[PDB]
Short mmCIF file of C-alpha atoms and ligand atoms in Angstrom, two decimals:
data_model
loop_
_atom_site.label_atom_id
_atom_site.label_comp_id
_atom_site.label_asym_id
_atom_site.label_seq_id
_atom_site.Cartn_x
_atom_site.Cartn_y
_atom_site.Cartn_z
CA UNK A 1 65.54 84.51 101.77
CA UNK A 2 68.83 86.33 101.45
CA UNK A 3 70.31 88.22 98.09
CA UNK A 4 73.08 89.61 97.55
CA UNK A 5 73.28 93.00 96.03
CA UNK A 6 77.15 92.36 94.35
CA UNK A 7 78.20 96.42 93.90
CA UNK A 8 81.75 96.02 94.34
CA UNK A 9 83.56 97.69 91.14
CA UNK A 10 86.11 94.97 89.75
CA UNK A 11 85.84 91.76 88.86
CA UNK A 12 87.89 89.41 91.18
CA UNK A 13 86.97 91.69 94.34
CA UNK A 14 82.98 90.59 92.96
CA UNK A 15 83.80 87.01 92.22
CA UNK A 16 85.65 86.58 95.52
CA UNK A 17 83.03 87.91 97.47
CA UNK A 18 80.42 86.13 95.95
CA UNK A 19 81.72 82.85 95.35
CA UNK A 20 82.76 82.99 99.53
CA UNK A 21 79.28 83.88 100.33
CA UNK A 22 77.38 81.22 97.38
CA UNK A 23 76.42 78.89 100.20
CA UNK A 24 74.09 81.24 101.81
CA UNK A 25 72.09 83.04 98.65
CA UNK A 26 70.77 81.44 95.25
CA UNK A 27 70.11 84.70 93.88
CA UNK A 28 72.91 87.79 93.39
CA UNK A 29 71.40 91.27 92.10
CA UNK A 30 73.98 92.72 89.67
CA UNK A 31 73.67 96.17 89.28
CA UNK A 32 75.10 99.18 86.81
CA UNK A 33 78.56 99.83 89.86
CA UNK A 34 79.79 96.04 88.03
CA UNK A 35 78.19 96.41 85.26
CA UNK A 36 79.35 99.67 84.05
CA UNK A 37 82.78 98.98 84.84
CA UNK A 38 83.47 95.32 83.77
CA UNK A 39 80.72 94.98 81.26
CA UNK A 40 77.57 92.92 80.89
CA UNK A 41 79.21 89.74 80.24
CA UNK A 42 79.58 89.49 83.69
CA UNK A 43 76.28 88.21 84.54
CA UNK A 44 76.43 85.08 81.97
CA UNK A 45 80.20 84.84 83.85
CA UNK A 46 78.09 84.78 87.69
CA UNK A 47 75.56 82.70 86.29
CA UNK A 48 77.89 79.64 84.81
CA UNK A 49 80.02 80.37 87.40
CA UNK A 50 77.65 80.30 90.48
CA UNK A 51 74.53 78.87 89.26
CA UNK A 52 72.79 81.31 90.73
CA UNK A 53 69.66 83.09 89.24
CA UNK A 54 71.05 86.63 88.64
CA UNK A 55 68.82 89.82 88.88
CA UNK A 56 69.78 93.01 86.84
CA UNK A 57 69.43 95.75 88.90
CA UNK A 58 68.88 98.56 86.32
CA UNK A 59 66.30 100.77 87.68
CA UNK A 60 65.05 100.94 83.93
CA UNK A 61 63.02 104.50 84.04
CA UNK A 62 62.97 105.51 79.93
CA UNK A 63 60.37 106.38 77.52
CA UNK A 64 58.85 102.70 76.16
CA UNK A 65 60.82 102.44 73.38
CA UNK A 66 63.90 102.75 75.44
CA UNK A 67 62.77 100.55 77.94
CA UNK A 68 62.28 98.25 75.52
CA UNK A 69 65.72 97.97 73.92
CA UNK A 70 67.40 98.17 77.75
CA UNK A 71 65.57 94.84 78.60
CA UNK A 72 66.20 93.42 75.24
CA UNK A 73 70.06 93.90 75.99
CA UNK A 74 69.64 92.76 80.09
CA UNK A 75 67.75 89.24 78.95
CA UNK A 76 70.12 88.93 76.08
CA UNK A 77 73.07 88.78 78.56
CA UNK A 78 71.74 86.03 80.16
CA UNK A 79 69.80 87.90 83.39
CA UNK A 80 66.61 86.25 84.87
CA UNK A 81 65.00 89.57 85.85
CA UNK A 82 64.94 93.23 85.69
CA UNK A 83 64.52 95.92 87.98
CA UNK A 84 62.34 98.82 86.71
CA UNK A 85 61.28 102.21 88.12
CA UNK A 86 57.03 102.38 88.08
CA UNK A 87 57.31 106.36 88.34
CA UNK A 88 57.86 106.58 84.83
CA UNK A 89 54.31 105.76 84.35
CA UNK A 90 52.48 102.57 83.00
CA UNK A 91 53.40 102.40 79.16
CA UNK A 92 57.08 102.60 80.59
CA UNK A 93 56.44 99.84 82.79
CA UNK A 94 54.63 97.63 79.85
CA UNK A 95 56.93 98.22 77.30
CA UNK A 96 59.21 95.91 80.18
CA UNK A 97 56.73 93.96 80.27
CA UNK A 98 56.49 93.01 76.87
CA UNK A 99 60.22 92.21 76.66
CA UNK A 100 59.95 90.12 79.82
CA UNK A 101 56.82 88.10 77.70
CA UNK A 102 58.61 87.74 74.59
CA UNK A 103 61.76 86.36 76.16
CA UNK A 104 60.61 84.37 79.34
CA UNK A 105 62.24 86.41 81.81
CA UNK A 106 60.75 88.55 84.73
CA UNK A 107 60.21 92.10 85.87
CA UNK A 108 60.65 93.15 89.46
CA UNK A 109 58.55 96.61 89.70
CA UNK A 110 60.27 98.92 92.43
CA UNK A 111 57.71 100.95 94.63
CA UNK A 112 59.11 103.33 97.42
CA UNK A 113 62.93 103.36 97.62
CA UNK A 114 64.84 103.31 100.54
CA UNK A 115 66.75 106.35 100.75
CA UNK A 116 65.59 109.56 103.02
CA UNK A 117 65.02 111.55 99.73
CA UNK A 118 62.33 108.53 98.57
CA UNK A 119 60.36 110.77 100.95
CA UNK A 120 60.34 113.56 98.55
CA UNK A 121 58.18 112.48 95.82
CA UNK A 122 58.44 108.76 95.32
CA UNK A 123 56.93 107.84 98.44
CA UNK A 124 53.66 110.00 97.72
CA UNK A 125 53.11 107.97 94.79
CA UNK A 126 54.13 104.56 95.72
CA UNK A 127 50.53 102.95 96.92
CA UNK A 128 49.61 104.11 93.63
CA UNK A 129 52.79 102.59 91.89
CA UNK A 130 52.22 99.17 93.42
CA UNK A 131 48.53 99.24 92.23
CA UNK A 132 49.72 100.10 89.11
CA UNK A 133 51.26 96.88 89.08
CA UNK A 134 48.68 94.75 90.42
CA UNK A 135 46.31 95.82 87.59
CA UNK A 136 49.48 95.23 84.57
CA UNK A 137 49.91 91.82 86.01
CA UNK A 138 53.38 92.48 87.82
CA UNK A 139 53.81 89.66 90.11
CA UNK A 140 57.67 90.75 91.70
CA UNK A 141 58.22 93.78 93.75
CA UNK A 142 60.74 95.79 95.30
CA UNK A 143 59.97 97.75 98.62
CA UNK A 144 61.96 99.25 101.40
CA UNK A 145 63.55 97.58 104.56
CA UNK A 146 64.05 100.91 105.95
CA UNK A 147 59.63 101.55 106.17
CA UNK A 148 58.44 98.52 107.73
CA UNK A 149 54.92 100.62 107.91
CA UNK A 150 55.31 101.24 104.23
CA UNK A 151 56.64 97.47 103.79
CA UNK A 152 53.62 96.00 105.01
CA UNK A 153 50.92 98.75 102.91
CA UNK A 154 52.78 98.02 100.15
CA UNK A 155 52.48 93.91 100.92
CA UNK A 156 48.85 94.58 101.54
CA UNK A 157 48.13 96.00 98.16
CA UNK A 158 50.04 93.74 95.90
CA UNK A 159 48.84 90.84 98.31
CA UNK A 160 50.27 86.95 99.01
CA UNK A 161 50.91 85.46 96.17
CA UNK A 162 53.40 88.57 95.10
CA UNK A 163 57.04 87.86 95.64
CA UNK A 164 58.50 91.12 97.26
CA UNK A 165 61.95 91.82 98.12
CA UNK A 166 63.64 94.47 99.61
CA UNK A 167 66.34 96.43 100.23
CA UNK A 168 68.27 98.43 102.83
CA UNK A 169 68.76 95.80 105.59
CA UNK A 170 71.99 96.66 107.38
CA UNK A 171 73.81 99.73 105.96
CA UNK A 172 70.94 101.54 105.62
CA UNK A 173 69.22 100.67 109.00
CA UNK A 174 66.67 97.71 107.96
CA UNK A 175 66.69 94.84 110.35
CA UNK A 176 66.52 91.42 108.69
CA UNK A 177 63.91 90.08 111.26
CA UNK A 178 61.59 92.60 110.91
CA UNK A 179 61.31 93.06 107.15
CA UNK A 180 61.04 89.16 106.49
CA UNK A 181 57.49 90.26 108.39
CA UNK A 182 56.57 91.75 104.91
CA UNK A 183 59.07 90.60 102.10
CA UNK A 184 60.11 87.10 100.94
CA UNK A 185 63.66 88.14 100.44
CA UNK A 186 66.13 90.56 102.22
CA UNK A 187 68.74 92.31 99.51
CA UNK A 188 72.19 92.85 101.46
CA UNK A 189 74.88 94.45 100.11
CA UNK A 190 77.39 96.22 102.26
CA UNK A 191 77.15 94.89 105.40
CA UNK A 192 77.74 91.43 103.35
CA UNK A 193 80.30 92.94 100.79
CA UNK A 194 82.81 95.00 102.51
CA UNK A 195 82.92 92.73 105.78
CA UNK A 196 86.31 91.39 107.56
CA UNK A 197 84.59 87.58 106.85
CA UNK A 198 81.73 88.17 104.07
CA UNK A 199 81.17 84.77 104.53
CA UNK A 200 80.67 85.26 108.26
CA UNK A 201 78.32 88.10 107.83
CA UNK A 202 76.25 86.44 105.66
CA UNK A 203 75.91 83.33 108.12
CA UNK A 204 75.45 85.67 110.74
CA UNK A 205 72.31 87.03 108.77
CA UNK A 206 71.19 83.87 108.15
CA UNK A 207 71.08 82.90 112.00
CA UNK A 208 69.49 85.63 113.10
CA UNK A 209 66.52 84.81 111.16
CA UNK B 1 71.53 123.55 68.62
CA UNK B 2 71.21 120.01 67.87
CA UNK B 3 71.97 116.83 70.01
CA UNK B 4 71.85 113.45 68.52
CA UNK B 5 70.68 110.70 70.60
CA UNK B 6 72.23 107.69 69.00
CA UNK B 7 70.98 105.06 69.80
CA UNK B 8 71.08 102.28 67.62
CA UNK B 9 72.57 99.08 68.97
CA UNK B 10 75.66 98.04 66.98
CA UNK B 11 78.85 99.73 67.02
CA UNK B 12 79.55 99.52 62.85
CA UNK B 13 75.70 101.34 62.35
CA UNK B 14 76.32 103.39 65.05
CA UNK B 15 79.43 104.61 64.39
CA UNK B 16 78.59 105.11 60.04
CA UNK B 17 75.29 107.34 61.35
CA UNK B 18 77.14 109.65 63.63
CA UNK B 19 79.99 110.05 60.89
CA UNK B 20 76.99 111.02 58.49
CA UNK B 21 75.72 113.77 60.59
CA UNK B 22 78.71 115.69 62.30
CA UNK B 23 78.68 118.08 60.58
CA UNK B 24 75.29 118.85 62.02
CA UNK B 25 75.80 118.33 65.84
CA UNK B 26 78.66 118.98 68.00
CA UNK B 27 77.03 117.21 70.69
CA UNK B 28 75.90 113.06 70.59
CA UNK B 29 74.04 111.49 73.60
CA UNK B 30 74.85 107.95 74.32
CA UNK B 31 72.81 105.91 76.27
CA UNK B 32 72.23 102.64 77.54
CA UNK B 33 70.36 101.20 74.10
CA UNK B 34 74.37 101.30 72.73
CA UNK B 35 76.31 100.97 75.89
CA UNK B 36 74.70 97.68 77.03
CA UNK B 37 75.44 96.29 73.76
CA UNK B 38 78.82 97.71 72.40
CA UNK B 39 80.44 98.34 76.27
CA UNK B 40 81.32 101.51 78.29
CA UNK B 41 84.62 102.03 75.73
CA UNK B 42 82.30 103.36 73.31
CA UNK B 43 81.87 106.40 75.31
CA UNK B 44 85.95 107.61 74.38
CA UNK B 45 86.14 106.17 70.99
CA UNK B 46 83.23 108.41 69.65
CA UNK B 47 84.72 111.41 72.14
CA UNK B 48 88.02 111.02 70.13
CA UNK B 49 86.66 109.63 66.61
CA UNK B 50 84.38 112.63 66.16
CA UNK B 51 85.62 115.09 68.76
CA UNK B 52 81.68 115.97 69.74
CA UNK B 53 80.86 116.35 73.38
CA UNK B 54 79.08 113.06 74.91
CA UNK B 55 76.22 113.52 77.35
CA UNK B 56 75.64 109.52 79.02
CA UNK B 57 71.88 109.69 79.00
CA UNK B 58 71.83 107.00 82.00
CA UNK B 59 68.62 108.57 83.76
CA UNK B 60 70.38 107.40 86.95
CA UNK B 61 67.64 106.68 89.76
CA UNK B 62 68.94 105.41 92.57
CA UNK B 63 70.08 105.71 96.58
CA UNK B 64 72.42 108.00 97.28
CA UNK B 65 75.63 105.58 97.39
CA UNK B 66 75.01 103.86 94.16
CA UNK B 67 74.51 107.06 92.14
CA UNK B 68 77.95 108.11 93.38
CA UNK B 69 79.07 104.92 91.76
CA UNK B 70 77.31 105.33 88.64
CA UNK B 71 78.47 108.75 87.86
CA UNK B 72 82.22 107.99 88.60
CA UNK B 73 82.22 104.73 86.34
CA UNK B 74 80.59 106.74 83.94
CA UNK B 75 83.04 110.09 83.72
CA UNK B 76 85.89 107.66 84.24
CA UNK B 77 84.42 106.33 80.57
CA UNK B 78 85.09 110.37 79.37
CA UNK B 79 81.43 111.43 79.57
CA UNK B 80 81.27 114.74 79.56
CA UNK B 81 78.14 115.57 81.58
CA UNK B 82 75.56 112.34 82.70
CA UNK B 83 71.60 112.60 82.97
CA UNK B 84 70.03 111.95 86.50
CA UNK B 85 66.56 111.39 87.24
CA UNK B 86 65.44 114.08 90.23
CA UNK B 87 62.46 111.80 91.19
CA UNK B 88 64.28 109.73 94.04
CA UNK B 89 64.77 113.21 96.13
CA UNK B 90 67.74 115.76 96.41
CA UNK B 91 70.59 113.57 97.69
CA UNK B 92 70.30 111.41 95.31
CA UNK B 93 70.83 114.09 92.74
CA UNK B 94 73.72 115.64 95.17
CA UNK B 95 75.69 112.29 95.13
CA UNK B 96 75.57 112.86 91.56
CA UNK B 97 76.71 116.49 91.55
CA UNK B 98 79.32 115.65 93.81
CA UNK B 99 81.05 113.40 91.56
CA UNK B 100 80.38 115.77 88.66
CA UNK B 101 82.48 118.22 90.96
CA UNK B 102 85.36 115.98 92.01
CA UNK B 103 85.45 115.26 88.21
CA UNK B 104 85.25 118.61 86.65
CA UNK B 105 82.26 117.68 84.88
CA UNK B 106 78.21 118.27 84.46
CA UNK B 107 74.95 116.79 85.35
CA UNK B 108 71.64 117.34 83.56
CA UNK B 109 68.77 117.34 85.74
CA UNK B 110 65.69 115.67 83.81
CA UNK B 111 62.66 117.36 84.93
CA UNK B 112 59.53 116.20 82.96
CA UNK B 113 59.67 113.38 80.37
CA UNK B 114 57.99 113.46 77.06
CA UNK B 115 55.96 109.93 77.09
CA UNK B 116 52.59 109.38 77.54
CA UNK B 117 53.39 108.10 80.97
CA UNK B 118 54.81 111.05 82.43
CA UNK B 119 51.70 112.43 82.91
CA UNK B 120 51.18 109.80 85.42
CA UNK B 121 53.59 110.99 88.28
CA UNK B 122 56.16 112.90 86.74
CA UNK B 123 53.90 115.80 85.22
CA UNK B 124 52.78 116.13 89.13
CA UNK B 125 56.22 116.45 90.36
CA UNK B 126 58.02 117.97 87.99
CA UNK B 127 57.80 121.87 88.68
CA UNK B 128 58.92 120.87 92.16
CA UNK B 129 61.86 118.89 90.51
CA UNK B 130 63.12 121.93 88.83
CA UNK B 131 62.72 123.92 91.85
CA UNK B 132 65.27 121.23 93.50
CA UNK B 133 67.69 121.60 90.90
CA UNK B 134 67.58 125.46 90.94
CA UNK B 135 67.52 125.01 95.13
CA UNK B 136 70.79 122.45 94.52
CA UNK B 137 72.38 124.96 92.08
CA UNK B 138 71.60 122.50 88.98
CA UNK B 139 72.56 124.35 85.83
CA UNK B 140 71.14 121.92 82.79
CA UNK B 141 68.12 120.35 82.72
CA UNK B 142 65.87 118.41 80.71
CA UNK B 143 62.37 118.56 79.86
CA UNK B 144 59.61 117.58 77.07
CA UNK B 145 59.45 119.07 73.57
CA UNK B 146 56.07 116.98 73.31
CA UNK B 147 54.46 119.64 75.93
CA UNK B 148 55.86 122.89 75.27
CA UNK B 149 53.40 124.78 77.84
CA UNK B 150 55.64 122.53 80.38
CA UNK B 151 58.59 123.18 78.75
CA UNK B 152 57.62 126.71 79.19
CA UNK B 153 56.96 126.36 83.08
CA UNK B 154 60.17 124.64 83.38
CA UNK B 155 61.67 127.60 81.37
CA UNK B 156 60.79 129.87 83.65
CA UNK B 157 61.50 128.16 87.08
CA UNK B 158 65.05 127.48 86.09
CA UNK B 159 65.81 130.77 84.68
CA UNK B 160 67.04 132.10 81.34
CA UNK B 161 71.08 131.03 82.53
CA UNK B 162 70.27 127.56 82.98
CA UNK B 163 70.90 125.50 79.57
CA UNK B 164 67.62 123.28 78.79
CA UNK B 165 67.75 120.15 76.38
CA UNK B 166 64.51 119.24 74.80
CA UNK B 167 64.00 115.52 73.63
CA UNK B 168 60.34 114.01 71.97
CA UNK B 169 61.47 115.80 68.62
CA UNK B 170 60.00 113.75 65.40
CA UNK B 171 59.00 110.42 66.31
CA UNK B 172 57.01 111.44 69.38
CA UNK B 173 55.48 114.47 68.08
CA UNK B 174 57.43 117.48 69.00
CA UNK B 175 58.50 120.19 66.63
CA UNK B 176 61.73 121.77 66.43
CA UNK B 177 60.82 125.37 66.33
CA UNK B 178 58.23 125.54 68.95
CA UNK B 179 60.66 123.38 71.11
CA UNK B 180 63.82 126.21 70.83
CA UNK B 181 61.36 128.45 71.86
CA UNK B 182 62.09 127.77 75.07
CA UNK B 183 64.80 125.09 74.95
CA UNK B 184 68.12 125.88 74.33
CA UNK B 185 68.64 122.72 72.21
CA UNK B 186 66.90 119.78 70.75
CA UNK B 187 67.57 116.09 71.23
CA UNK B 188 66.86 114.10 68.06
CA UNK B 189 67.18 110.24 67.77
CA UNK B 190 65.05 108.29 65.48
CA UNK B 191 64.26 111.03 62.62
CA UNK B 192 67.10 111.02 62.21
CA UNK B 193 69.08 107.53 62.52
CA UNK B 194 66.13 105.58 61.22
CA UNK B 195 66.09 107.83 58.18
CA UNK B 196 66.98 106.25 54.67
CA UNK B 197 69.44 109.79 54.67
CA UNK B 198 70.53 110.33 58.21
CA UNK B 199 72.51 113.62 56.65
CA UNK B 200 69.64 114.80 55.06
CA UNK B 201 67.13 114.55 57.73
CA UNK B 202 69.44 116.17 59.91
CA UNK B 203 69.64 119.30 57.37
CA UNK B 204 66.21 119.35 56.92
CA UNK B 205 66.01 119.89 60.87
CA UNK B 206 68.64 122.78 60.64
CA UNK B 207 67.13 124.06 57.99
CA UNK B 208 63.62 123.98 59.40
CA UNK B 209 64.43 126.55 62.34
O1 BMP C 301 65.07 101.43 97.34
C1 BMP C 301 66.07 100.82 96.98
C2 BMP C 301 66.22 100.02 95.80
C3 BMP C 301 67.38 99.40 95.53
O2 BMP C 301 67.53 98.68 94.51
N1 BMP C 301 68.48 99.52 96.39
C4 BMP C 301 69.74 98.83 96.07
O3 BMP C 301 69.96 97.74 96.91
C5 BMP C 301 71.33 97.66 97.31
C6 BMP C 301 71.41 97.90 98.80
O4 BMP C 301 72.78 97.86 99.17
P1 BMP C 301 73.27 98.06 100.68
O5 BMP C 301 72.86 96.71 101.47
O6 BMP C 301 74.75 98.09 100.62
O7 BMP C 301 72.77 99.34 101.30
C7 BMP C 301 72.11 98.56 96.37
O8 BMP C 301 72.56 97.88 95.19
C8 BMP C 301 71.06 99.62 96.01
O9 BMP C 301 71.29 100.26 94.74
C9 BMP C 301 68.40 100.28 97.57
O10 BMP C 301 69.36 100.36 98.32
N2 BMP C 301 67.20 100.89 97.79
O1 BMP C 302 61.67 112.60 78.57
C1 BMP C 302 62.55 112.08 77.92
C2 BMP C 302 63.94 111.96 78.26
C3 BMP C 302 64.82 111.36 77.45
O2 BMP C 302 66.04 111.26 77.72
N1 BMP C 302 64.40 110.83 76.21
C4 BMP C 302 65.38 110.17 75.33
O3 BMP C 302 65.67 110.96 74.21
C5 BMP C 302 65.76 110.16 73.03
C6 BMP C 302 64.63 110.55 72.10
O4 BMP C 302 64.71 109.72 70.95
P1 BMP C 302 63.68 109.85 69.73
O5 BMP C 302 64.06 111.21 68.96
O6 BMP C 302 64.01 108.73 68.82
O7 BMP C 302 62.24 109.74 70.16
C7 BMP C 302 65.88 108.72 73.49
O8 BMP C 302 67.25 108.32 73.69
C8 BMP C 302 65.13 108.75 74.82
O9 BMP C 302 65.54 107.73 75.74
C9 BMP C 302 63.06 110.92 75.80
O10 BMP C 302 62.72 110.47 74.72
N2 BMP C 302 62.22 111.54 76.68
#
């Protein structure tokens, strides 16, 4: 129930990390900080590598047509899933979709962010952003570890059988425990990643749940 | 008054459509469509091959510390100003401006997009977006040549200083002349790289206003 969120900037700092902390996680979410500074071959590279299922972390939040082409690329470098923004509205959100479809991949729909400014307009929206979701046949979610209240709305509306995960345990001020109430996975990044003993941290993590 | 949003997939297209039209644009926006697929390098090799001005269009949307990230990666690349998404709140958007400081470079603000979509939860934000920007002392901005009532609205919470780039030109309906109206320039992608006469189509445009 544990994924890494691997933002470190160079390669051998990333693979070090992540190959320390493998033991713990199955799944590492590789966002645009690696990506955009070592390239998007290094998610095939973590995924031979590690054998871990890798998700792109890519906030996709174009026009369809856009959105369309950024997944194409994502899947195309070997990722299992995407992350993409619902306040873009729902052609933006199909047009992922589609991709998702015609390559056998998945689309994790983020909600309410965890950040204070998420307050400012994206929380007003997200109940409406999760239903959104529900009725275009989303069945992954992303929702904040930071709004346990807003957690477990958002769990109620996209109900059981939806596989939510969320971030902003430790850095941010989530606690593990407490989220796992609501989501089936904890993202960790920090707290994991720039640790004395990443590999301690994680374990740590693990125990306390 | 022209920006061309490139963004075909492979380098050797890329690179023989921009050539075409240079003489029409001093100004090409790259996004992720081309740098997922051809790599962050691209961003300097068009900056030096055709000496135009390159604007990442990477609609960054995320917390605070990962936009930081983002935005350094990408100037690092030699983008001269990057897109951000004012959605997730005001520090996300001040992470970004505080690179963009530290750099010596600029950020665009996108306000209201020009899909279908937006009207869903952007449309309903928006005016307070630009209001942020103005608030965070924001200086370009974005917003939808498909609704030029909005663009007007935007026009005049930002003020006649700011610089306002208009994309949704062509392909999704907007027209160039009622877009400069209100927007200092126009982005144009498909009408003119999916054109049998890239050149030509661009002309036309410049001729047209
Ligand atoms: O609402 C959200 C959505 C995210 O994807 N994230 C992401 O999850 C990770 C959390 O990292 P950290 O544990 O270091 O705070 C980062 O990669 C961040 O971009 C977040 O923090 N909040
Ligand atoms: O609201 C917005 C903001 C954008 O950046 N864009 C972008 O501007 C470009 C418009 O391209 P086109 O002229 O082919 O429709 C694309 O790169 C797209 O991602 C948009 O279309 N609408």
């Amino acid at each position: 129930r544990l994924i890494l969120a691997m933002d470190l900037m160079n390669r051998d700092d990333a693979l070090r990390v992540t190959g320390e902390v493998r033991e713990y996680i199955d799944t590492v979410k590789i966002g645009y900080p690696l990506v955009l500074s070592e390239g998007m071959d290094i998610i095939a590279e973590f995924r031979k590598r590690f054998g871990c299922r890798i998700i792109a972390d890519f906030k996709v939040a174009d026009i369809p047509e856009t959105n369309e082409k950024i997944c194409r690329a994502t899947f195309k470098a070997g990722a299992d899933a995407i992350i993409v923004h619902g306040f873009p509205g729902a052609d933006s959100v199909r047009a992922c979709l589609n991709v998702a479809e015609e390559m056998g991949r998945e689309v994790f729909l983020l909600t309410e962010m965890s950040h204070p400014g998420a307050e400012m307009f994206i929380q007003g929206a997200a109940d409406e952003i999760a239903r959104m979701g529900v009725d275009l046949g989303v069945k992954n979610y992303v929702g904040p570890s930071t709004r346990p209240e807003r957690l477990s709305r958002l769990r109620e509306i996209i109900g059981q059988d939806s596989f939510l995960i969320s971030p902003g345990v430790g850095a941010q001020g989530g606690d593990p425990g407490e989220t796992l109430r609501f989501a089936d996975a904890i993202i960790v990044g920090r707290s994991i990643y720039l640790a004395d003993n990443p590999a301690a941290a994680a374990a740590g993590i693990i125990e306390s749940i």
